Amino acid sequence: LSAIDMYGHQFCIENLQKLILSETSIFDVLPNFFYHSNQVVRMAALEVYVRRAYIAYELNSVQHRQLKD
Amino acid sequence: LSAIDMYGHQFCIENLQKLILSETSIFDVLPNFFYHSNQVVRMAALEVYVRRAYIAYELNSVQHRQLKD
Numbered sequence: 001l002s003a004i005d006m007y008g009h010q011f012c013i014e015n016l017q018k019l020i021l022s023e024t025s026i027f028d029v030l031p032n033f034f035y036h037s038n039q040v041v042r043m044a045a046l047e048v049y050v051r052r053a054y055i056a057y058e059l060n061s062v063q064h065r066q067l068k069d
Numbered sequence: 070l071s072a073i074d075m076y077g078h079q080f081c082i083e084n085l086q087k088l089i090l091s092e093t094s095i096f097d098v099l100p101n102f103f104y105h106s107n108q109v110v111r112m113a114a115l116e117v118y119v120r121r122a123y124i125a126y127e128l129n130s131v132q133h134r135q136l137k138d
Contacts, residue, residue, distance in 0.1 A: 069135075
């Protein structure tokens with residue numbers, strides 16, 4: 001939480017490479033806040049989770065939507 | 070700001086009375102932060118500001134809005 005930018009930018013890709021080059025699996029606690037009241041930990045954690053799935057595939061575009069509310 | 074609930078509850082009814090029963094004058098410092106980055110406590114703190122302006126007039130409806138982003 002300290003790491004995360006928490007503007008709309010939310011480019012904490014470097015901390016993410018520590019996450020993706022984590023000896024530890026981060027599906028354990030990461031879920032408790034990625035449905036926290038904080039749009040940033042929601043969004044970030046969620047797409048990296050995608051990435052934690054498709055580490056195998058090639059991702060050519062990923063856009064976040066933010067709907068109805 | 071710590072006091073402020075920061076959720077949809079947003080019950081700073083009592084805190085508005087501490088603002089209006091403040092040994093400290095609080096039109097001074099409160100304004101510096103109600104344009105901080107955090108939308109719910111924004112909502113709570115800000116509407117208490119509303120309440121501190123028109124406590125004199127009669128308010129029959131107040132909706133928090135949430136724009137562009």
